[PDB]
């Protein structure tokens, strides 16, 4: 395959499009690397995966020497290339090369809104939050194609999943009718939800 696209938290199996028996594993050299930067090395019998990858990467020898990235992160994006070399008596002549580029989708689920009264005559508060997305999200409240100011807006990124979570609060006077949209931009995409407030 040329291109591959998986979701975040999901597994990515990048095949080397080549297989090698255990007897040959001795004489064979395997170079998996992500854009010139090494990943793992199965140097003739002895394997050694770089620290950057030690944790979330598996080397599936049995399955065409593939590398399985567990718990995908938006940064795993990139072009992987797998070169295997056979020892042509006197040297190491490479007998194969596969190359695949990996895409990682990280859409933001449609945000959900909560509404409830605060201790202030007529004022109702709404909270729009969503998460599990990438890149960093940008939340904005709309009223009549106008951008209202947000009361509170937190945005953090999980060190583990490498994913974001947004949550913003907004107040409005219950006396009038209202129709707000919570727009959330992340990259060149955008997700949203609305809130209708009918007076009496
Ligand atoms: C903003 O809202 C969050 C979540 O409700 C809360 O933890 C935080 O204290 C608020 N920030 C301020 C300055 O009140
Ligand atoms: C709430 O709405 C009423 C009716 O329009 C208005 O008199 C009052 O000043 C408003 N208060 C706030 C905090 O918006
Ligand atoms: C808000 O979300 C809806 C639901 O997917 C979408 O159809 C609409 O285009 C969005 N509106 C804007 C201004 O992004």
Question: Taking the C-alpha atoms of 88, 94, 95 and 97 in order, what is their torsion angle to the nearest 10 degrees?
Answer: 170
Residue 177 near ligand 2, beta carbon < 6 Å: no
Q: Which structure tokens are listed for 16?
A: 């080397």
Q: Which domains does the chain have, with CATH numbers?
A: 1-105 (2.60.40.10), 106-200 (2.60.40.10)
Give dist(CA 51, CA 5) in Å, integer.
25
Rounded to the nearest angstrom, the distance between the alpha carbon of 121 and the centre of ligand 1 is 21
| C-beta of residue 156 within 8 angstroms of C-beta of residue 165 | yes
* Of residues 150, 192, 149, 146, the one with CA closest to residue 169: 150
Buried/exposed code over 120-130 (b: 16+ C-beta within 10 A; e: otherwise): eeeebbbbbbb
Q: Which residue has tokens 């998996």?
A: 32
Helices (H) and strands (E) in the chain, counts: 2, 17
Tokens read off for 142? 């709309």
Cβ contact 97:17 at 8 Å: no
Calculate how far, in angstroms, residue 147's C-alpha sits from the geometric centre of ligand 1: 21
Neighbours of 12 (CB within 10 A): 22
Alpha-carbon dihedral sign for residues 192, 9, 99, 75: positive
| CA pair distance 190, 139, nearest whole angstrom | 10
CA distances from 56 to 31, 45, 50, 65, 99 (A): 18, 22, 11, 16, 20
Under 8 Å between Cβ of 86 and 111 = no
Contact 180, 195 (CB under 8 A): yes
| Residues whose CB is less than 8 angstroms from the CB of residue 186 and which lie 6 or more positions away in sequence, other chains included | 108, 133, 134, 135, 136, 137, 138, 164
Report d(CA 17, CA 14) in Å as an integer.
Answer: 9
Rounded CA-CA distance 169/146 in Å is 17
Q: Which residues contact residue 154 at a Cβ distance below 8 angstroms, ignoring those fewer than 6 apart?
A: 166, 167, 168
In ligand 1, the atom with minimum distance to the C-alpha of 167 is: 4
- Inter-CA distances, 98 with 11, 18, 129, Å: 19, 8, 42
Q: Which residues lie with the beta carbon below 6 Å from any ligand 3 atom?
A: 183, 190, 192
Q: Which residues precede a break in the chain, with C-to-N distance above 2.5 Å?
A: none
Cβ atoms 95, 19 nearer than 8 A: no
């Amino acid at each position: 395959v040329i291109h591959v696209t998986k979701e975040v938290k999901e597994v990515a199996t990048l095949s080397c499009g080549h297989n090698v028996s255990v007897e040959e594993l001795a004489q064979t050299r395997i170079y998996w690397q992500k854009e010139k930067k090494m990943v793992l090395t199965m140097m003739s019998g002895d394997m050694n995966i770089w620290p950057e990858y030690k944790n979330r990467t598996i080397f599936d020898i049995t399955n065409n020497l593939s590398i399985v990235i567990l718990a995908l992160r938006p940064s795993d994006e990139g072009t992987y290339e797998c070169v295997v070399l056979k020892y042509e008596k006197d040297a190491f002549k490479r007998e194969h090369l596969a190359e695949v580029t990996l895409s990682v989708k990280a859409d933001f689920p449609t945000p959900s809104i909560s509404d409830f009264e605060i201790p202030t005559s007529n004022i109702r508060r709404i909270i729009c939050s969503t998460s599990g997305g990438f890149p960093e999200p940008h939340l904005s409240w709309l009223e009549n194609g106008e951008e209202l100011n947000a009361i509170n807006t937190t945005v953090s990124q999980d060190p583990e999943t490498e994913l974001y979570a947004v949550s913003s609060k907004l107040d409005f006077n219950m006396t009038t009718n209202h129709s707000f949209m919570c727009l959330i931009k992340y990259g060149h995409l955008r997700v949203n939800q609305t809130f209708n407030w009918n007076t009496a």
